[PDB]
Symmetry: D2
Subunit: 445 residues, 4 copies
């Protein structure tokens, strides 16, 4: 029978909480979602509501677009608690968290113990980790942070009410890498007890590379200092994930956070907080005040059930292939223009070519190139000039955008992130070739 | 011409940022949304993306349900900043914030200066206010809080890293009201400089009533202490809103926060932070780290454009009418069962009847009644027994659920919140009548 | 339990095939439709297809918009037969036909024996009746037809391959009515055996009125001639339906046909063929070659389940009320302009006011008025001048649009059909007032 | 600019009425459809309606699923006429007909002069052709028809009111082919003037093959007899289409009809009537009484714009590839079971393997095999036994399902039609292997 076949897949999902190997048909998925929504009290035929939060909906467009899931996730006192007024939404949350734990394993952190989706972006999710740690370490005021010029993760420390201690990176060839000795020197200077945590970063803009997590995990273990990893867009990278797995095996990592949109191709606004100590990850979840949106969870649930394990693995494989293609094409273009691809082997996602030939003419040509690319409908390229000075949440960054005060040259940043197509690379190369030719003609003529 | 008529309404909205008096047809709304989504770079026909956040979407179900709005709101460094990669989503955010400012005025706070939608629930939004105030008042550690037994707003203070100072309420007739003298005694005891803010509450469970905001505003003004108002579900009440307006006219109110779901009949997960000092409200917004979901904003935009000013006013009028109906019906039922409606004239939304006839038999009958109602598909009723002891985020509440250590009696709580129908009251009354008869027969026989 | 409540309604529908008294929630309806679609073999998870009609769909937009119902209705040899490849679509067809039989009863023909939805408009559905009758009456060549100036029902006879015999109407006061003596004179002239059927009409443009069905039913009974009734938009009228019921009680009516769009507020393209002799109605159905669209059936099923019996009755009641309102408003406007409402008491839907004051100036003012109304976004008004000559499918109509060669005056036609709102009448009156004033000023100045 | 890019594609479509080479994004398509729907008067903001057909819609689900296209296609007197009440739907119809003419050319009939979509299935569409020809040839009573055991196309002649003259096929090797001499003998016997048309068939169940259209076109040309081609599922086949093109070049073909679902992967219920003489094809269109559904047209429009020319060509290519794969796999399976693939080179879509090893045991094993396949979720396979006698619309077919009285053996029919996947063939082969093994074990043990 037809219905029994659909029921079989749903039962499989419910029993073991795992991603199906092959993606579900839309028919099975929508049957499932409708069944779940039926379980929420706001959708009961015989329901009457006499409270202030009854999940009433004014607009049919709003009700339909959310599959009639209105109550959000959690209870008033606990985002992790089953909501008796919303049994279907509760199940939705539970299954989604289980699917995500599974995917974290698949992606390369096979020892992850606990995780939960939180409907806040990565910056605010990092903030939530810091807020949790306040209560564990009431003497702490500082967060030690190897520099990365990204405003959200920087602001996350300030928003939490802590003082970032910015550790400058070491130039090693073309790469900017973790200054482990500076990290330790700051721990000793300020005192371990006064450090809330070390806040490290994996996926990042080239020529920075993922932090030396193994060595940082050892430092944190030895000094008894929490270690929080900003894995914003590292889940899509087996290299980044293995770094986290290794870190956890050789030392201390207390939490790692990743963006839903950047790793699962869904709207901005959700993140996953994960870790190796279940009580601690639970403590972070319990720190969340109030109910929360179910919308990011629904998105990732729809996405993972539709892809299956095989679909997601395929996307990860294709990203690695696109990285190789992007790198080859960009090196070819760069060398044709008397530039070079910066040697950034430790960065698995992000690449950079030099812009030495247009820089140094005192005409803002690097910044102009970024503008020209943007007007030609290239998005996500970063034209990084030298000498930017910017103050962000109380800290003045010299060489802002380059993750160092004195990076040797201007460069252009491109990346092969999940869901990239050959057309993205090909149009980019074609448009970049044209823009470079235009700038050089202007500077020459 | 047909298209020109639609364009006229869209232009009207764009020019003045105001709610249309009459609600838009679905056709106009969906034309508008599709036009806006077209403006986001991820939807450009000629686009190529070479970044880590390109708003790529894997599932067509996910893309469609969000009207192809994928980039969220804000920039990395600023949730209020226009996003050049998402011009349509930026406009969506700007218009939604303008519509909401207008509705706040319509609802009764005609002097509101600034507001923004934040895709977090009210608890976390209150937390964000406290996080902002940390930086203004680095010596402060305490938040003075007139007691209300609601876990989210309580946890919001703890999550922010502050010590709540719980002020017990005064029993005045049947009502529990603000103890102004206790509030002042604590300010003097602890020192104004050590108070982060006063955290007051408007809409609440009867027999508590909205806080004495005028008097609290004077205290805060005189002692130079910020005043943050938890208006979670008070926007739907002209009485609550006038209280805020009056508070701002006679003294100090720095921010007031309200729930999107509870006041606009949309999914849980969004809130509005509003105030009278634009730079300060802007400072709260700037404290948010990273981009955020556009989903709550889209929901309220769809809802407000569909209702128009007239539709929303109608809902507010109907809520007042349902309150009268609920009150009359509940008083009639109560008196028929030898109970009474508690005299709570200062509470415009929430009502309570006594449960003296089933209480005191040492059989947990009050709690049982709540269970019986729930199993009969009544949601949102609160059966409040005497003597609950509960510890929540480090504070032990005696008489938990009753907002006092020693409320004189057990009671049942019902409310007339926005979107309530006659059927809600009628089914509630019928089912409650039956449950009371059952409990009394059990206790009698 | 939640799901059981939905199942109860679905089981009720399936058991007795009747319209629910109250309309289903959207949630129940969409649960039902998804369940039905699951039953169609094209939606089976384990299906493989090796035929030329597998219900494959290329576009997801197409699949979704039709709720994954792709196989249509019927088998190759029989539109009424259960389709083993599409059990869900078969059930959809069966239930829809049962719901429609019920509604025909509700609407006033309580003795209807059999009916089926056919995904053709009324003209083609009338054609199908005539095609069926060919085989019953191989000697017949003529269809006797009391005149109505509507091209579809006229063409239906020609398309079927028969010669219409146009019977002119009798002017009785302001009304144009059936010439019973002319009908009989033609039967005698041509011979009963050479008449395929009498083709009568109920709902029609004023000042024509529904045909004298009782008397025509007697004539047909006595002469042994089939009687086919064009009830295109008469189902919405209890007066029209009672006329059919009475006709069937006092004489012969073999089939009556009505438009889905005009009576159920759904897209154009479907009709219902109904009758009192089940074998004969079955014979009409069996005359249909091939499978047919399920789209009109799905539309009416969604519509009737959503309205319930009460919702549909309400619409019928509201139409009667709008007719009274339209009549009162139009009479008032007419008399204000020195015109009058034509006395057409036997027409329950359509009304006419005279246009004597603008007619007769040799300037095409009547036709101009129709154009002016149209440009001011009034649709469905008919400005009928005198003296139109038009040849339609071989027949030359003098006085075309007026259903007579020599109607005494020009007039404007307005109607109160199902789903009309007060705004329709009010805007119409306002716009008509303005247009008349403009024409008269032009003719005066 | 973003919107301009979408406008460019829409303008391209509107100017030349041609299929885009590459498929449109969903965003462009839905922008277009919404723009078109805005043009229909029922969707005008300032509209008032005072007629009986105002395109009012009761259910929001119905309105939305049809993109607010409610008025259907055509005017009362003409399905081809622009509808002033529905300018958007009129444009929708015009563009769809233009796209389809283009695709007919692409598919292999490059000299097609005129075509139109009709929202009836192929049987009824054939009927419409015959109904048109009645008026051209009032002396005609017979339709000469080379036998094919398919009930719809057979019934189409009877429904139109004509006597089919069934011409038996010639067994040539394994193939059943047109008996040209029998066709001519009947023309001479009955008289050319008494023949309404020759009704030939292209795509068909093996071991029948497409009719000898070149030779039939010559016969029709010479005898002055219309030629109507049932191309139900031949459009997807360049072999079938070239046969039609050749027929038109060497003789007479007046019309050819094809199924929307079978060739374009959309719901059942639509067809395309096409021809080489524009006035005649126009005459067929004009024979349609009344307005008609726009739903099939919308489906094919969405489908063709989404695929583009390249997407449709790809599907045609893939069908040829799947035919080769199906043939190879079926021959391999057949020979493994001591059966053979019937030699049917002139049939490009449909294949047959012998069932001699299970036939002849007087146990209905062939029919049982068809049942067993069906219960194992194989659809579209035809198990054809010998000796079926069936009367269909007055004609008794001996050997029914085999297109001959005395086909030499029982066989199983499988086909590679458009949209077939490797999984369809692979599951079919696996399941067929199992079923054959089961039947043979039963017959052996
Ligand atoms: Cl990697
Ligand atoms: Cl109020
Ligand atoms: Cl009536
Ligand atoms: Cl072919």
């Amino acid at each position: 029978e037809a219905r029994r076949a659909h029921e079989h897949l749903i039962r499989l999902l419910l029993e073991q909480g795992k991603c199906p190997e092959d993606g579900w048909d839309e028919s099975t998925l929508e049957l499932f979602l409708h069944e779940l929504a039926v379980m929420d009290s706001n959708n009961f035929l015989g329901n009457c509501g006499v409270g202030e939060r009854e999940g009433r909906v004014a607009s049919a467009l709003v009700a339909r677009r959310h599959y009639r899931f209105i109550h959000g996730i959690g209870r008033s006192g606990d985002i992790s608690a089953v909501q008796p007024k919303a049994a279907g939404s509760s199940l939705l949350n539970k299954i989604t968290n289980s699917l995500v734990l599974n995917v974290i394993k698949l992606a390369g952190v096979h020892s992850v113990a606990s995780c939960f989706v939180v409907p806040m972006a990565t910056g605010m999710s990092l903030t939530l980790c810091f807020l949790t740690l306040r209560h564990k370490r009431p003497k702490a005021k500082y967060i030690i942070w190897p520099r990365i010029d990204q405003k959200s993760c920087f602001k996350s420390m300030v928003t939490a009410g802590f003082e970032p201690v910015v550790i400058e990176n070491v130039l090693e060839g073309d790469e900017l890498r973790t200054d482990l000795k500076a990290v330790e020197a700051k721990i000793q200077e300020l005192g371990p007890e006064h450090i809330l945590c070390l806040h490290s970063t994996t996926a990042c803009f080239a020529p920075r590379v993922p932090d030396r997590l193994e060595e940082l995990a050892v430092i944190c273990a030895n000094y008894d200092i929490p270690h929080v990893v900003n894995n914003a867009y590292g889940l899509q990278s087996s290299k980044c994930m293995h770094l986290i797995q290794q870190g956890a095996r050789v030392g201390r990592i207390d939490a790692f956070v990743q963006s839903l949109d950047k790793n699962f191709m869904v709207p901005v606004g959700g993140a996953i907080i994960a870790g190796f100590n279940e009580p601690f990850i639970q403590d972070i979840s319990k720190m969340y005040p109030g109910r929360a949106s179910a919308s990011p969870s629904l998105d990732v649930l729809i996405t993972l059930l539709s892809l299956g394990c095989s679909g997601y693995r395929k996307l990860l494989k294709e990203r690695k292939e696109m990285f190789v293609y992007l790198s080859t094409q960009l090196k070819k273009l760069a060398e044709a223009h008397n530039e070079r691809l910066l040697q950034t082997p430790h960065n698995p996602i992000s690449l950079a070519m030099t812009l030495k030939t247009i820089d140094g003419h005192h005409d803002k040509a690097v910044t102009q190139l970024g503008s020209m690319l943007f007007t030609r409908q290239v998005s996500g390229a970063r034209a990084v000039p030298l000498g930017n000075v910017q103050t962000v949440s109380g800290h003045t960054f010299r060489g802002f955008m380059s993750h160092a005060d004195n990076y040797p040259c201007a460069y252009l940043n491109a990346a092969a992130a999940i869901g990239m197509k050959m057309q993205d690379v090909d149009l980019f190369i074609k448009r970049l070739d044209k823009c470079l030719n235009i700038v050089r003609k202007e500077q020459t003529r």
